[PDB]
Amino acid sequence: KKFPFKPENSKTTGTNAIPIVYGLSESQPNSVGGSWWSSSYITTTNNEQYVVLAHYLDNPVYTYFRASTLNLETNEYHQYVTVGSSTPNITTLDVSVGNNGIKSESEDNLSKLRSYSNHDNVTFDITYDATTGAVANGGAGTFQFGEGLTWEFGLPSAKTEGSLTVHGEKLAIDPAKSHTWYDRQWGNTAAIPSNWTWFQLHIPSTEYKISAWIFSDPFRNTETRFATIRGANDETLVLPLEFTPIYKRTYESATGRVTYPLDWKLKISGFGDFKLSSYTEDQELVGEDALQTAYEGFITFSGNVHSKPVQGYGLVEIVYSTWDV
Ligand SMILES: *[C@@H]1O[C@H](CO)[C@@H](O[C@@H]2O[C@H](CO)[C@@H](O[C@@H]3O[C@H](CO[C@H]4O[C@H](CO[C@H]5O[C@H](CO)[C@@H](O)[C@H](O)[C@@H]5O[C@H]5O[C@H](CO)[C@@H](O)[C@H](O)[C@@H]5O)[C@@H](O)[C@H](O[C@H]5O[C@H](CO)[C@@H](O)[C@H](O)[C@@H]5O)[C@@H]4O)[C@@H](O)[C@H](O[C@H]4O[C@H](CO)[C@@H](O)[C@H](O)[C@@H]4O[C@H]4O[C@H](CO)[C@@H](O)[C@H](O)[C@@H]4O[C@H]4O[C@H](CO)[C@@H](O)[C@H](O)[C@@H]4O)[C@@H]3O)[C@H](O)[C@H]2NC(C)=O)[C@H](O)[C@H]1NC(C)=O
Incomplete structure (x- = not known):
């Protein structure tokens, strides 16, 4: 079956009525540090569907770019992680390891973006426009993550163009039937949780976009388990x-x-209940250590939202920052 992937056509920060704790453009450039990430839900011009991931991380020990493609008809999956050394402290967004990375193509560092990869088994060149109301995690864009703060926003249904190369054939992306979730996250500390699960959920019968986090906080000795849900009208x-x-x-x-x-x-309290399933078994980005490794898998789910039955899709991220203990 085919999924109803499609983009939104709205303003990034809506009305700005909600006083979030940063400007999106100012938070994009290399100099800010942290993590830049995209998952594209793609229908090609020949009606094939794919899920394509791209991710650059800056860290004081190393940098890396990692990427994957998943064919939804056949479950054929390809991934790689490639390690780099440093990130230039420039005032725009242009991160890369080799000829693979993420960059802005617009002056505001935000309105037009690109994820690209030229690995032999993972080759794509995907652009996306910020035509989608932002998810400001925590309500205003920040929340407690490990021993200190994290800052995170998602652009959930970005209009998407470009191509994916599959076995020497360059497939064109259909923008009417595709969208990209772009996630930008940067940090306060190196003491991040030991492991977590993150859900990115789409419910096509609604305007809800869900960014949900679960992990232990051993510093406050509590359990973090919450969702930030962006609705219609910046709600x-x-x-x-x-x-x-x-x-x-x-x-x-x-x-x-x-x-x-x-x-x-x-x-999810007062919202609904969901049963979620990984689309296929092997969806792991395999790196040299724990922080370079992640399960980044396409998922489908059923459930109920406000007493109405629903179906949907998205991604689950499973990360261990350490394998110790
Ligand atoms: C981040 O990563 C985390 C780690 O990967 C991850 O957490 C893990 O999540 C899973 C999934 O929920 C948990 O799995 C459950 O575990 C229950 C047991 O939990 C207890 O034991 C573990 C293990 O403890 C040992 O190991 C740790 C380190 O690994 C040590 O720290 C301990 O000291 C201890 O060490 C000894 O043992 C080792 C051998 O294992 C030795 O190596 C060692 O040397 C020592 O000798 C503890 O970690 C747990 O503590 C943690 O969690 C509890 C909350 O549960 C907290 O209170 C605590 O503070 C810690 O946080 C805990 O002590 C399993 O029982 C459970 O499986 C049952 O339930 C499932 C689902 O319902 C069933 O499918 C399953 O079949 C089991 O059901 C049977 O048993 C129950 C209970 O009796 C019955 O009610 C039931 O009806 C059924 O019984 C029937 O079937 C039986 C089987 O056939 C049969 O025997 C019966 O007779 C009957 O017929 C499930 O597997 C796992 O614990 C978590 N681990 C941790 C560390 O938290 C986390 O999710 C990640 N986070 C995110 C956000 O992703």
Whole structure:
């Protein structure tokens, strides 16, 4: 079956009625540091569907770019991680390891963006425009993440163009039936949680876009488990949830260090309940250490929102910042 991927056509910060704690443009450039990330839900001109990931991380120990493609008809999956050394402190967005990276193509560092990769098994060149109301995590764009603060916003349904090269054939992206979620996150500390799960959810019968985080805070000795939900008209919901990982189906990491569940239940307080399933077993970006490794998998789900049955899709991220303990 085909999914109803499609873009939004709205303003990035809506009315600006909600006083978020940064400007999006000013937060984009290399000099700010942190993480730049995109997941594109693509229909090509020949009606094939793919999910393509791109991710650049700056860290004081190293940098890396990592990327994957997933064919939704056949489950054919390809990934790589390539390690770099440093990030230039420039006042625009242009991060790369080799001939792969993420950059802005507009003066405001935000309105037109590009994720590109030229690996032999992972080759694409994807542009996307900020035509989608932002998700300001936590309500105003910041929340407690490990020992200190994190700052995060998502652009959930960006109009998307370009191409993906599959077995020597360059496939063109259909912008009427595609969209990209771009996520920008930068940080306060090196003491981030030991591991987490992050959900990025789309419910096509609604205007809700969900960015949900679950992890332990050993510094306050509490459990973080919440969703930031952007609705229509800039409305934002910050809601507790209950998280249940289900290990009936698992995928064993290629590093031998962890086992990933492949199904979950979420109960988001006052909003709805969901049953989520990884689309195929192997969706792991395999790096040399823990922070370079992640499960980044396309998922589908069913559930109920405000007593109405719903179906949807999105991505689950599973990260261990350390394999110790
Ligand atoms: C971030 O990463 C985290 C780590 O990967 C991850 O957390 C993990 O999540 C999973 C999924 O929820 C948890 O798995 C459950 O675990 C339950 C047991 O949990 C207890 O034990 C573990 C292990 O403790 C050992 O190991 C740790 C380190 O690994 C040590 O720190 C401990 O000291 C201890 O060490 C000893 O043992 C080791 C051997 O294992 C030795 O190596 C060692 O030397 C020592 O000898 C603890 O970590 C747990 O503590 C943590 O969690 C609790 C909350 O649960 C907190 O209170 C605590 O503070 C910690 O945070 C805890 O102590 C399993 O019981 C459970 O499986 C049952 O439930 C599922 C689902 O319902 C069933 O499918 C399953 O079949 C089991 O059901 C049976 O059993 C129950 C209970 O009796 C019955 O009610 C049920 O009906 C059924 O019984 C029937 O079937 C049985 C089986 O056939 C049968 O025997 C019966 O007779 C009956 O017929 C599930 O597997 C896992 O614990 C988490 N781990 C941690 C560390 O938290 C986290 O999700 C990630 N975060 C995110 C956001 O992604």
